[PDB]
Amino acid sequence: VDVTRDIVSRERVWRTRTTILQSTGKNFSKNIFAILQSVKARE
Amino acid sequence: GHLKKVTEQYPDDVEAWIELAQILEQTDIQGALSAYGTATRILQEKVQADVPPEILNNVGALHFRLGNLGEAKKYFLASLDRAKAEAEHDEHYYNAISVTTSYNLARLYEAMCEFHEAEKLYKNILREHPNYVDCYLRLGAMARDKGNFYEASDWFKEALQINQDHPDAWSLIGNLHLAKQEWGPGQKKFERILKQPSTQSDTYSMLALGNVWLQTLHQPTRDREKEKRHQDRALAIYKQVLRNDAKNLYAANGIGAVLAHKGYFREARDVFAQVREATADISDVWLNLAHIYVEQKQYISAVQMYENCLRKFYKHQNTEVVLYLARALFKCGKLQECKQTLLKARHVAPSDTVLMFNVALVLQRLATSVLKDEKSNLKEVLNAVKELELAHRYFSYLSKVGDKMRFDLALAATEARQCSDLLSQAQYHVARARKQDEEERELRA
Amino acid sequence: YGILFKQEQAHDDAIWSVAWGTNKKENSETVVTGSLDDLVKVWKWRDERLDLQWSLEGHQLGVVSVDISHTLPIAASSSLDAHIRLWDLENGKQIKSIDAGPVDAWTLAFSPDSQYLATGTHVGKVNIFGVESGKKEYSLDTRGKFILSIAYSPDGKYLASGAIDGIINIFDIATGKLLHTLEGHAMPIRSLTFSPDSQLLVTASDDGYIKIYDVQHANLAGTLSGHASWVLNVAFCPDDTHFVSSSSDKSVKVWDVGTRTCVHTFFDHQDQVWGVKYNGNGSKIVSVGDDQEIHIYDCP
């Protein structure tokens, strides 16, 4: 039916699952994978 | 920038604020609310034209995320009225506007502690548009609240059948199996159905796999080179999701978890540092950070976290939180108050054996702490014997129970011998209590 | 509709139950409260003020339930200590101590005749002890998980039991036999009470839904959407016009038994309210909770 495309075409979804997953800020892996590799190196 | 430019000047602006809000929805909700507020009043000077229902619906939606639940409800009702007034707006489909307005209103009522009205409104949507998904799923969630085997489990699968290409529905199907973890290894298949490249990349399902693979941890079979491989597989999943997304907090969370399991608590704090700094308002981070603290002989820094996690309006006495609360407590305030919280927990559900065992253990700890090296107040010696007797009765009772905490409690015999020699010591120290009594007596004389 | 009295720091420890009388047998004027501080405080609600009258002790563990005999001015208090101790409000003295060992002791249930005392059992049965005997007279052979709530009908015709999994067991105190087993809930039933007319049965499950069923034909009379947290305690207005609900969200909702509508709500408790009870007329509604403050709510 047309109702589906009628609604989905005008609505807006600001947040979804992945949006929840990522932090709102800027937290890159540079400060993380560094330790992730250091620990392995010691092992 | 363009909106900023137009805002200052007033070239008879009518719709500029509409755009302002339309952009600000993702950003600070209040900016959009203010934009809508000013826009509402800018639409009555040129003519006496009733505000279109869409704007009022959108502002009510903004409020819905806020505490203005009643105000948002009034907005939604007015939007429904106005949309109904749109008899000649078939091209704009006033019907769809009313549909979304009612959907939002039902969501609010479900959030307003009125599930009857939420169900009624969702069913009013269903009767007129069965091809819709979200309401069919919210009804299932509402029925799930009472129980996971009720029409929730059926409505979710039916929603998937009518739309198998809906990630939300399939993830919900994946969630159904979470209530019963007996599908530990088997839930991999149902969680890999939609991992096809067309759906990829999907971080939600990948993190679900990482979790269900982490759940397998905490077993005594690690020495069999089995839990190590599981750790390695989970770590690899986390690394991949980290590479493809460096801003996903949950990957870092799971990495910190596995490192703690690897024994790097001194190093677990650093990794959990970033996740906490991003957003500490997630149940898991509190508990993991408390785990690290309590591991370092810091109950001072752990009990507060456990309390804060319990500050949420979901429960008051959770069993797991208290179980993690009493780890190495030996101080006066961490034994008697530990008993208080233990009773609080067992109050909601006494059926657990672990509570009945920890209570007796702390009872014995206190009894020996006052009946071995004391030589303390007398009335305490009077109460210690009653406490030890109750601990002994519980020791007798706990032995007859079949199932245990995945570990048989046949090791209560040492507890019985401890209680026996404690009884002997108490019968010995009551004499000391009497001597102290006669001492204070001759003193006052 | 408001709050009359506000007792601050009513106890050292959190209060989990409250008992107030309804008859004229020197009970409606005295409020008996059981808290985790092992303090059975017999408050005399005299001069429209809550004044302490007795302070009974002896329970090793915190008080779990408190209730006043309908046809008698004495009371009793239980705890998880397996030592249900009877008390007399006339003198503030202990009558006896039923040692419901080793651990088998749960909330109390005064019979309307004030002759029998029902107690839940970990084995899932409901033991019926004698008030003047203290020995196990007869136990209801309806096993399962555990008895979480027991209530006596005001006229003593039926008796319902709330299990850990939303299983209502309708027994017959007239013959001590299980009549109906209403299973409209899957959540642990916290507490329940009979309507003043012994016609409706309210269930306080952990789903936030007040499903009021019918006892005569064991049917659901309607699903009512309560609070957001778990409904802890529930009581009927003695005139049988409304019923208060105590939940785990600092909310005291007075729902209408007839219209299933919230006639009023109180938010004066900073913590969760554990106990709510009416007055002998239904105007005053005493309330307890983790806040350790007794709030008397006046609803003329």
Swiss-Prot record, chain A:
Disulfide links within the chain: none
Expression across tissues: Found in adrenal and parathyroid glands, kidney and heart.
Signal peptide stretch: none
Renumbered residue ranges of the record's region Interaction with CTNNB1: 1-33
Origin superkingdom: Eukaryota
Localisation per UniProt entry: Nucleus
Post-translational modifications: Phosphorylated. Dephosphorylated by PTPN11.
The protein's role, per its UniProt record: Tumor suppressor probably involved in transcriptional and post-transcriptional control pathways. May be involved in cell cycle progression through the regulation of cyclin D1/PRAD1 expression. Component of the PAF1 complex (PAF1C) which has multiple functions during transcription by RNA polymerase II and is implicated in regulation of development and maintenance of embryonic stem cell pluripotency.
Subunit composition and interactions: Component of the PAF1 complex, which consists of CDC73, PAF1, LEO1, CTR9, RTF1 and SKIC8. The PAF1 complex interacts with PHF5A. Within the PAF1 complex interacts directly with PHF5A. Interacts with POLR2A, CPSF1, CPSF4, CSTF2, KMT2A/MLL1 and CTNNB1. Interacts with a Set1-like complex that has histone methyltransferase activity and methylates histone H3. Found in a complex with BCL9L or BCL9, CDC73, CTNNB1 and PYGO1 indicative for the participation in a nuclear Wnt signaling complex. Interacts with PTPN11. Interacts with SETD5.
UniProt disease annotation: Hyperparathyroidism 1: An autosomal dominant disorder characterized by hypercalcemia, elevated parathyroid hormone (PTH) levels, and uniglandular or multiglandular parathyroid hyperplasia, adenomas, and carcinomas.
Membership in a protein family: Belongs to the CDC73 family.
This protein's name: Parafibromin
UniProt source species: Homo sapiens (Human)
Gene: CDC73
Range covered out of full length: 218 to 260 of 531
Curated annotation (Swiss-Prot), chain B:
Tissue: Widely expressed.
Transmembrane segments: none
Superkingdom classification of source: Eukaryota
Compartments, as annotated in UniProt: Nucleus speckle
TPR repeats, residue ranges: 14-46, 53-86, 99-132, 133-166, 168-200, 215-248, 249-282, 283-316, 319-352
Physiological role: Component of the PAF1 complex (PAF1C) which has multiple functions during transcription by RNA polymerase II and is implicated in regulation of development and maintenance of embryonic stem cell pluripotency. PAF1C associates with RNA polymerase II through interaction with POLR2A CTD non-phosphorylated and 'Ser-2'- and 'Ser-5'-phosphorylated forms and is involved in transcriptional elongation, acting both independently and synergistically with TCEA1 and in cooperation with the DSIF complex and HTATSF1. PAF1C is required for transcription of Hox and Wnt target genes.
Complex formation: Component of the PAF1 complex, which consists of CDC73, PAF1, LEO1, CTR9, RTF1 and SKIC8. The PAF1 complex interacts with PHF5A. Interacts with KMT2A/MLL1. Interacts with STAT3. Interacts with SETD5. Interacts with ERCC6. (Microbial infection) The PAF1 complex interacts with Zika virus French Polynesia 10087PF/2013 non-structural protein 5/NS5. The interaction with viral NS5 proteins may reduce the antiviral immune response by inhibiting the recruitment of the PAF1 complex to interferon-stimulated genes, thus preventing their transcription.
Protein name in the entry: RNA polymerase-associated protein CTR9 homolog
UniProtKB/Swiss-Prot annotation, chain C:
Entry-linked SMART domains: WD40 (SM00320)
Coiled coil: none
GO biological process: negative regulation of myeloid cell differentiation; nuclear-transcribed mRNA catabolic process, 3'-5' exonucleolytic nonsense-mediated decay; rescue of stalled ribosome; transcription elongation by RNA polymerase II; Wnt signaling pathway
Record keyword Transcription regulation present: yes
Locations listed in the record: Nucleus; Cytoplasm
WD repeats mapped onto the chain: 10-53, 58-97, 100-139, 142-183, 184-223, 226-265, 268-300
Record's keyword terms, sorted: Acetylation, Cytoplasm, Nucleus, Repeat, Transcription, Transcription regulation, WD repeat, Wnt signaling pathway
Cellular component annotations (GO), alphabetically ordered: Cdc73/Paf1 complex; cytoplasm; cytosol; euchromatin; nucleoplasm; nucleus; Ski complex
Highest taxon of the lineage: Eukaryota
Pfam hit, one: WD40
Job of this protein: Component of the PAF1 complex (PAF1C) which has multiple functions during transcription by RNA polymerase II and is implicated in regulation of development and maintenance of embryonic stem cell pluripotency. PAF1C associates with RNA polymerase II through interaction with POLR2A CTD non-phosphorylated and 'Ser-2'- and 'Ser-5'-phosphorylated forms and is involved in transcriptional elongation, acting both independently and synergistically with TCEA1 and in cooperation with the DSIF complex and HTATSF1. PAF1C is required for transcription of Hox and Wnt target genes.
Family: Belongs to the SKI8 family.
Self-association state and partner proteins as the record states: Component of the PAF1 complex, which consists of CDC73, PAF1, LEO1, CTR9, RTF1 and SKIC8. The PAF1 complex interacts with PHF5A. Within the PAF1 complex interacts directly with PHF5A. Component of the SKI complex which consists of SKIC2, SKIC3 and SKIC8.
Protein name: Superkiller complex protein 8
Organism of origin: Homo sapiens
Lineage of producing organism: Eukaryota, Metazoa, Chordata, Craniata, Vertebrata
